[PDB]
A paper describes a structure:
Ferritin ubiquitously occurs in animals, plants and bacteria, and plays a significant role in iron storage and detoxification. It is a nearly spherical 24-subunits-protein with exterior diameter about 12 nm and a hollow cavity of 8 nm. Like human H-chain ferritin, the ferroxidase centers of HuFtMt are composed of A and B iron binding sites of conserved amino acid ligands His65, Glu27, Glu107, Glu61 and Glu62. Herein, we take the compartmentalization concept to re-design the intrasubunit interface of ferritin to create a new compartment for fabrication of fluorescent Au NCs, while keeping the inherent protein cavity functional.
To determine whether wild-type (wt) HuFtMt are able to bind to Au ions, we solved the crystal structure of wt HuFtMt at a resolution of 3.0 Å upon protein treatment with gold ions. The refined structure revealed two Au ions binding sites where Cys102 and Cys130 are involved in this protein as shown in Fig. 2A1 and B1, demonstrating that Au ions exhibits the high binding selectivity for cysteine residues. The mixture of wt HuFtMt with HAuCl4 exhibited a red color, with extremely weak fluorescence under UV-light as confirmed by its fluorescence spectrum. This is most likely derived from the formation of larger-sized Au particles in the presence of wt HuFtMt. Indeed, the UV–vis spectrum of the mixture of wt HuFtMt with Au ions exhibits a peak at ~ 520 nm, which is characteristic of the larger-sized Au particles rather than NCs. Three Au ions-coordinated Cys130 residues are located at the ferritin threefold channel (a relatively unconstrained microenvironment), facilitating the excessive growth of Au NCs, thereby losing luminescent property. Three Cys130 are involved in coordination with the three Au ions, respectively, which are highlighted in red.
Residue numbers in the entry:
A (entry chain A), B (entry chain A), C (entry chain A), D (entry chain A), E (entry chain A), F (entry chain A): 6 to 176
Write the structure that this text describes.
């Protein structure tokens, strides 16, 4: 390749893997998004909240796909695995799963950054530090906030709790 | 379910399958989209054209997911299969694959409409007739147009052809 | 904690210490700010200059407090020590003390960054690199500039010098 | 001093003390402010409410610092003591501590006014009467209101109570 | 020096060298810029494209000169070497030389970043990561794109190719 | 060449030389520009004044490069020599060097005009008369003015002088 400079094949692989992980999380949030528009769940702000997260994660993937073409790498796509559940059980459960999901995305991204360090790709280091490492910290903190309020409010057994969180926090 | 009326389990299954098919085509077009921003391909309008198609197909899926929740069905998601290639070979080849893809989407949708007919779901009939059956005819005709010009122009061997089509038709 | 990931207790402590250091510098600049509105000093631009620095440093502290809550840490506040003097002696002396102060803030921040490196917190690395390491370089260079002109002009013995610097540079 | 007229050294000392007290309350409210942005508390309006109080109290200090320079006195700053807690326990507890804090600020200010009376400083009397004595009465009444509603609503055991007060009163 | 902190003489030298390298590339692009306004070449968009690159590289140098004065270093300037050719041969050849040039600039900058790492200058690390390491990746990818299209189009023997690239891509 | 008419090879050479001279003066002024943003010099208007002169001289070069391509000549570039000093000593010294520099540029340009006269290039005569001969007279007179005031004010020993000239003339 005529553009490739200082781009280690293992970083290339790392990125391709990370692209799949970001697509997977977009799918998980799309699943949740339409879980909440169910007639027997019907929390439309939860539904809009997770649909926005989903499209946000698709943007994450595209940046990485864009990073692979910028550096000289070759995007190699894999199947996008279906989420662990179609029935996300409750607004609380969906927030806890979202929280657990993003800490794993964070892990993988922390692992990616580390590979880039051992390979002397400062550009890739700066890439993850700039667009991912802090997006994740805010996502994880925000999700943490949401998890905490819904527990303190009494979700999901308190019939009022998820309905109020929907209308007042996510509105 | 308290919303379900005149909604046959086989239509439900049909829809869930169709949702996966629409996600698959969105993925195929995303793959092509980033194929053309490669430094050794670098047809940015082809890349923008297929990225728009991709997001358009994601919208297709969401409507169907929305249709499933409206009728009383239960969205059951499957893995999203990786496309047949990561190297779409040329602007012409990518248009021919896109054309072949959409005729299959069309087939499945024609098959879905037929199931809905034999099951007496006029609502589902009208759904596909309204948002899908003609979107497909226009997609297939448009793709057909593109395929024809690029052949007539001499793609991909004519070095000028794909570059001009990029700048003048897809610009 | 449910948000904490890859956040070493020594980094937590480092941050809590740094928060106090940033509050301390805000206090030092508040002291200077009101030193210059004295009727027997009466350099109102010096006074406005240092009052702006003070509020700027309070902002520094808040970001760090915000960083501690984002990562899962626990803000643990300490007394805010009074400055070394209430009588900052002259506009020159106050600039030299400000310069010496910020090089220490810089030291501590350089030390903090180093801890984060040895602990594999790339997020915290990027945090300090983004909002602190360069703010400090500009502060130190700006203060350096000010120190130099006031010396070259003859502060504080030249009765004209501090009065002109006040009206022409800090105006 | 050439500006000093009718300004008793004990009033000067009183003011310097009061300046420290006003800085202390600003710090207490800053602590609370970031207590509520904790991921395991996450009441963002409580957090904004107390952060505004904090900056309001910093303004209190500055006026007094400004009063000292106007009259001929000499600002003599002391350490700013850390608050009694870093864990403000609940929105209710934080309001009760805020209420108790401001009644003490009020006490000290009432004591200051009294000193000024026995010393024949009508200017200082008018100063406190104009910018402090009523600011305090409104703060104390407002805090009283807040305390009462949160008790009546069932804070902190009622999971709904603090969450609703956050969104509906402090929003 | 009174501003210098944590600034290693070898980093200083590195920067001074890098400043010359950035001036050299500005000169190379100025040469190309006026190569294309030749009456026997006359590709005015190529000429405008390279003249913009040139001024962009002068900006690169100035930032580094600004970085040297900010940190306490001393700008030490060297001769600016004439480019390797005055006759850049063709639009394709000029793009290939530009591509090769920027990968070297990139190399030097990657080497500079590495020096800064071994010297514990995180500020200088962040400087290059922020304003240079990615500017280079985009330049190299963009130049790569251009190189590829002009080859695929048949430059320079195809009389149409450079003329169309001029009017349609660089217009 | 098909555009060349009445264009003597010695004029061509003259122009190529003059182009280098104009690049040299641009470099000298860039050096001065960043000399004054030094933390131990810190005359920001001097710095802006000389940075504007530098870009102005780059424009001079480009016109001559443009003149060479217009007439049929061939731009042949040489190394751009580093200036005589990196330490311009004082605002006065920098103005005196600038003054001496421009009288030499003027000399060379007067010499160029003379060559054009003996060669019967009235176009080149008119070129220099129109864009250079008077730009130089104004530059030299302006620089002369500046030199005179700074001497009369007492530069560089008078600590006030350069600082006031910076803020009041060059502001
Ligand atoms: Au789970
Ligand atoms: Au790295
Ligand atoms: Au195919
Ligand atoms: Au039907
Ligand atoms: Au000192
Ligand atoms: Au790190
Ligand atoms: Au209490
Ligand atoms: Au009184
Ligand atoms: Au070459
Ligand atoms: Au570093
Ligand atoms: Au000289
Ligand atoms: Au002539
Ligand atoms: Mg993500
Ligand atoms: Mg479709
Ligand atoms: Mg600070
Ligand atoms: Mg108060
Ligand atoms: Mg550059
Ligand atoms: Mg000139």
């Amino acid at each position: 390749s005529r553009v490739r400079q200082n781009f280690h094949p293992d970083s290339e692989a790392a990125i391709n893997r990370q692209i799949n992980l970001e697509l997977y999380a977009s799918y998980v949030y799309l699943s949740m998004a339409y879980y909440f528009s169910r007639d027997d769940v019907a929390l439309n702000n939860f539904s809009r909240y997770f649909l926005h997260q989903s499209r946000e994660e698709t943007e994450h993937a595209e940046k990485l796909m864009r990073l692979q073409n910028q550096r000289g790498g070759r995007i190699r796509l894999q199947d996008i695995k279906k989420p662990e559940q179609d029935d996300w059980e409750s607004g609380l459960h969906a927030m806890e799963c979202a929280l657990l999901l993003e800490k794993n995305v964070n892990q993988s991204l922390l692992e990616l950054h580390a590979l880039a360090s051992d390979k002397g790709d400062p550009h890739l280091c700066d890439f993850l530090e700039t667009y991912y490492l802090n997006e994740q910290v805010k996502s994880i903190k925000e999700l943490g906030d949401h998890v905490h309020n819904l527990v303190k409010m009494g979700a999901p057994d308190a019939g009022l709790a998820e309905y109020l969180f929907d209308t007042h926090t996510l509105g």
